[PDB]
Specification:
heterodimer; A: 489 residues; mainly alpha; Serine Threonine Protein Phosphatase 5, Tetratricopeptide repeat; B: 50 residues; 1 helix; 0% strand; General negative regulator of transcription subunit 1 (chain A); General negative regulator of transcription subunit 4 (chain B)
Amino acid sequence: RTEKFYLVFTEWVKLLQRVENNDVITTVFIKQLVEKGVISDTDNLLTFVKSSLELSVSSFKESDPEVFIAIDALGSLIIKLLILQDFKDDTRRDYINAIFSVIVLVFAKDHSQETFNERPYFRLFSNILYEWATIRTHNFVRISDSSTRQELIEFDSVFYNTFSGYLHALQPFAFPGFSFAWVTLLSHRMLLPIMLRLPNKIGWEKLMLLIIDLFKFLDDAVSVVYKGTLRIILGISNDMPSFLIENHYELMNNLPPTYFQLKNVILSAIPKNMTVPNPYDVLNMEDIPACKELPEVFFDPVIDLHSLKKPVDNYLRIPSNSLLRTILSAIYKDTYDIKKGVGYDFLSVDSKLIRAIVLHVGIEAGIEYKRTSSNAVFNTKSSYYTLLFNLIQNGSIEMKYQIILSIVEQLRYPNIHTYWFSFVLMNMFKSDEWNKLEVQEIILRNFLKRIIVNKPHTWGVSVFFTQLINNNDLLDLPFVEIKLILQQL
Amino acid sequence: YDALGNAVDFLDARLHSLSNYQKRPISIKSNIIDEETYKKYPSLFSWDKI
């Protein structure tokens, strides 16, 4: 029975080979398939693609040299049936998802010992991308423009996001061997660049899902992943730097702190059109009109704030000392009572939670600046500063560490957050009313660990590092091999 | 020596599991491709139904 299906695909491989695929005979061939009972039912169709793939991998076997003439023909068949077939309203979505499910299904069946190789599957996925990348050229103009075209335009954004979903199924965590082969597909010239350039960031949702899978793995066959991870973010930093700026919140959360180099590149990212002044040169950012702009954020941190949305906002309005106690009590609760971690990072201070707070305050502080003349937003007695100031003083050591860490991370390109949080860091460092050596040491520690690593050094830290000496209030800090840096710069 | 059960056996069933999911007839675009030209072409197959 299965041998029959093999003979059919044997007819397809022989036809397309030695013939230009563009010729309409191939479209008639698939029209000949439905004539018989082979493709008559979907149960047989998915069975046809099933066996057709297992044959290509077998055909790849026993091959001394690059036999893809069998699998590349299949890759075109997948696309040729996606376009040449008449689909119902929701059926087109189920179709592409079905085939992808089969491909990854065989992959798992192959990964289970029964001489597995990761090159042919990679070739198949690559062909599907290259093929579809050719079809979607200029709003799908190549097709008849019968306004079946219109159906494909709406399918364009749904194709990659679903494809990214099936790519996630073969994440490095799943298959160690396919790890390197997985990164190369992520950074495919037909996948990464256009999804970043998709209309209004629709694809950014699933692009994150893949990078997080990459970060969680980093938290050996890891070297190949990290080495591949770096050239992606850098590639994005040049192509679409906004992607690193807006989604920084959801990105910094799942990124281990051990990686300081990778940290900077994300925060060092700047918009394409913009150009910045020399940071190492000496004040008055009010003169700069660029920092007044509000930095966009794709993911609002208020969601992961959950129940503290009320007491924080009520505190941001009026600084109630009674409302301060409950907020702290909530943090201490999530740290010790519940949300117990394991091993290292046991009784963790929820970095996501702390980062969400510090970021949320900055956002609300930004809106408060766009409105109402902006004179009030910067003060020692301002509510936006009062909250961050009190959480530190009443917070524990590890608790204070995360707050300062989060603040420093927001110092990026010339925006109001960088402007504000800098004024926070600057003021706090020179701020009295503390009982102080402990705090300043954390101010320095979390800040110092952003310059020592190789460039590019972020703009925000560079300026704050400059005005610090320019402010004149040096090594006088008694805690300072720490003095080795002073001689460095 | 696993009786029937195996990782490869479980998955091969999954591919068949997904096949019978949402059975539909494959509707080719009848409007397109100049029908009655299709009738002129050869068999182009070695199929045997049953």
